[PDB]
Swiss-Prot record, chains A, B:
One GO CC term, this protein: lysosomal membrane
Subunit structure: Homodimer; via the transporter region and DEP domain. Interacts with the GATOR1 complex and prevents interaction between GATOR1 and KICSTOR; this interaction is disrupted upon cholesterol starvation.
Official protein name in the record: Lysosomal cholesterol signaling protein
Domain description: Cholesterol binds at the interface between the PIN-like transporter region and the GPCR domain; these two regions likely coordinate to sense cholesterol and regulate mTORC1 activation.
MF terms (GO), sorted A to Z: cholesterol binding
Span covered, complete protein: 35 to 710 of 870
Gene behind the chain: GPR155
């Protein structure tokens, strides 16, 4: 693989670690507001321009692929055009220009240095180093070209509150100043840096990415607001347009403009899937316009982009490797299972702290969570009689289905001993007497499972209400893996693999859906 | 001569004609304020950018002499440094920064397109066409480099009323926008212009210089104010620093950096001697700072630069040609005599309208003016018995000296028949019985004159007070030409020629000194 997915997961977890440490620092108030703004200055005024100038004078113009760069830029501008015209066709004139401004720029800007560069650079430090210059080629040009549009769009708003006076007088940020500034010096110098300032630049600009994520975490606390009325819907519309559609538009426009291209097209999709940048977050603050829906977009952007970038990074490579396809699905199930335990350990603690043993489904939900916790504490066995211990884990896997079927019975009781009964104990008897959980032995494993999961989905077809919602969201994955178990058992085509991945991320990730519940 | 002085005078008079037509249009109100601002828009927004872009894309970068250009620029910056430090050493801190700002920029900017380009282009259309590109090479770079200094100097003033906020945030005009803009297109295009827009550009930008001077004339009315207290002194200090010193500094810095160079060094002095530009005039309006001393500088700048540019243009060429030295002095005396009649005809009309025949020296002053009017109506004979008619003119020339001696007697009477007596009638008898006025015959002409002019200067040594002042200012030229008549009569050396020029501009120009009186 051109990208090192073996490192993708690792690199994803370190960036997540810094950003969540920043989040918990903001929550626990271990960092004072004074030194918080001090670090904000240290990044924005000092370290951000530092790495900009450093990497841009380092940036090599010997070969600048205009195909990929201009394809990305015009795809971004297309996203701007489609979104801005649609919102002018749906929004009210009053908020139309205002909504054909910030909303596009909020759906087009990728915090490239925050996570991406770290991720893509960990994915391509040896294979395609040019991608480390495309990342700082794309963003600055996007800022210079397309930001003025949305900016002048808002000038028409302050008009509603003078073309050359304000519309373009004020229509046309240290990034672009230092960016273009680093281009003047890269031409003045022979793309070189003198040691005297070079040491300071390296010391200061390489201490930014982690600090940038730390500041982001300091800016993710107390930001999401209850906006379900009409904002969460348009919020998730913006999120999908920026996180899937925009990558899809780039993936198609690169193939209409530019196997290396395939991975480059995979890199195209690899781009745009980045969460939204804080540049728009501070632009809205300057425009003091509906920051709550933009700050929420900032939060959920990372919150959902992280799982999406992970799953997509795995998906785009499966056509490229059946034996490594089994190894890849095993590895991804293993890793998601690990973080699954993260969510599974935070879940059991919060349920025991909140006294969820109550006779309501809450106690039934505590059972589901402990079952999944066993499912992942068994998944830690997977990599490093070693299956005679796997049998209890796989029983616990079946358990997740039996407990949720009886929880469906409980919610039916809400509208009107089997818990620990565990008919899957007889499934274990079948296992003992009659590489993966589905490779336990022959075709009986996913047969005994095919029937058990179906018994629960039928029981399903026949904050307690929040637990009912959890039951629904999980029986979605019940259908998902039902489709897998019937498909393989009927016929053992580049289609069974993706549903393998989906039932993996469902059977290994529902812990998160319950985490939210 | 590299410059066509034969055309210098002609070209000087046409530009003067347009600018004085603008002045008289502003005075007589034949142009309404509405169409006045309409023409102001037509020039500034339409025709100024037109010719900027046109000539700059036409501008050839095949050979750009950096020696001359950078020498001029650093000389201008030196003028900025010396003037700004001195005024910070003399002005009060309160008005110091304010006076180390506008005052330098008011002493460094040349309205290059207004008169110069027309003049220098008439002087070099065939000899040195590169000077037509140096004129638009110098100015824009001066605006881009040195204007920000004085501008930020005034930002420190508004501070007295924030480095990146205002000092440089507001520190860094359509000229520089279109100027640099015409550089981007001159690189984009092959220094070419498409006919479609080329015709409009030529039609619009070639109708600017005359219209620019017309607007200047509309901005010269009701601008000078009585500022003798401490402003006229610093005003004339600024004027001399910009009109002689600055050209001298350029003339020396070009010889330390760059016969062609000699004329190029003469061109160096030919530059800087231009009157101040209206860019500073509108900058001060934007800064609303002591416009009266800046508007007065605008007025007197042209008012005195025009005679100075003329006389200097003649002076710098005299070492370059004795027979053509006599032809040149004859031509310059002829031309100054012509305009002399302009001042002499406006003078007699105003004195007869004001009833100056009063027994006070006013009537004696009316006699001086009519004598000088005869002196110039005889000078019109000079180019195209033809000397037996010259005799009355030369008698009238001696008359100017005899009337002013008896006017000195009159002013002595003020502190205590000879008018028309005219002992110069006996000088005419000497002329008849005993190429130029000094070439009338042998050495007796400037001998009979040597004694007559001395008799008046001795009578001098032995608004009536304004007429006394006029007598003093003219007896200055009496000394000046006394030095000539004694020098030639004693010894007939690149020194007698310049005093020939001075006694010419005095004996042919006092009409102006009396014009003011």
């Amino acid at each position: 693989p051109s990208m090192s997915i073996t490192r993708l997961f690792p690199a994803l977890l370190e960036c997540f670690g810094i950003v969540l440490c920043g989040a918990i620092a903001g929550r626990a108030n271990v960092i004072t507001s004074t030194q918080a703004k001090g670090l904000g200055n240290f990044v924005s005024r000092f370290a951000l321009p530092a790495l900009l100038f450093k990497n841009m004078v380092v940036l090599n113009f010997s070969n600048v692929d205009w195909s990929f760069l201009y394809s990305i830029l015009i795809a971004k501008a297309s996203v701007f055009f489609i979104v801005c015209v649609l919102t002018l066709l749906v929004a009210s004139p009053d908020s139309r220009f205002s909504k054909a401004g910030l909303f596009p720029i909020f759906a087009t800007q990728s915090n490239d240095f925050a996570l991406g560069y770290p991720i893509v650079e960990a994915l391509y430090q040896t294979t395609y180093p040019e991608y480390l210059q495309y990342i700082y080629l794309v963003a600055p040009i996007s800022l210079m070209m397309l930001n003025p549009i949305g900016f002048i769009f808002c000038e028409i708003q302050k008009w509603k509150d003078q073309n050359k006076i304000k519309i373009v007088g004020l229509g046309l940020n240290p990034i672009v100043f230092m960016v273009f500034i680093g281009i003047a010096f890269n031409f003045i110098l022979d793309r070189k840096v003198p040691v005297y300032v070079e040491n300071f630049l390296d010391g200061l600009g390489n201490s930014f990415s982690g600090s940038a994520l730390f500041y982001l975490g300091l800016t993710m606390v107390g930001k999401i607001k209850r906006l379900k009325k009409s904002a969460f819907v348009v919020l998730i519309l913006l999120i999908t347009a920026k996180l899937l559609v925009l990558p899809l538009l780039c993936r198609e426009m690169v193939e209409l403009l530019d196997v290396n291209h395939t991975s480059l097209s995979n890199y195209a999709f690899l781009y745009g899937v980045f969460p939204v940048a804080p540049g728009v977050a501070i632009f809205a603050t300057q425009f003091n316009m509906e920051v709550e829906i933009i700050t929420s977009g900032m939060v959920i952007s990372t919150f959902v982009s992280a799982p999406i970038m992970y799953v997509s990074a795995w998906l785009l490579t499966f056509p490229t490797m059946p034996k490594p396809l089994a190894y890849a699905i095993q590895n991804v199930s293993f890793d998601i299972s690990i973080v699954s335990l993260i969510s599974l350990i935070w879940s059991l603690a919060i349920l025991l702290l909140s006294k969820k043993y109550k006779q309501l489904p809450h106690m039934l939900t505590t059972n589901l969570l402990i079952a999944q916790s066993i499912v992942c504490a068994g998944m830690m066995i997977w990599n490093f009689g070693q299956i005679l211990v796997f049998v209890l884990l796989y029983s616990s896997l079946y358990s997740t289905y039996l407990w949720t079927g009886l929880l469906a019975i409980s919610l039916f009781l809400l509208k009107k001993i089997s818990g620990w009964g565990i008919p899957a104990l007889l499934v274990g008897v079948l296992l003992i007497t009659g590489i993966d959980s589905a490779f336990f032995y022959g075709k009986e494993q996913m047969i005994t499972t095919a029937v058990t999961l179906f018994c629960s989905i039928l029981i399903a077809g026949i904050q307690l209400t929040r637990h009912v919602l959890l039951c629904l969201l999980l029986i979605i994955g019940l259908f998902a893996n039902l489709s897998s178990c019937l498909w393989w058992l009927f016929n053992q085509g580049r289609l069974y693999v993706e549903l393998q991945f989906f039932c993996a991320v469902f059977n290994f990730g529902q812990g998160f859906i319950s985490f939210g519940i």
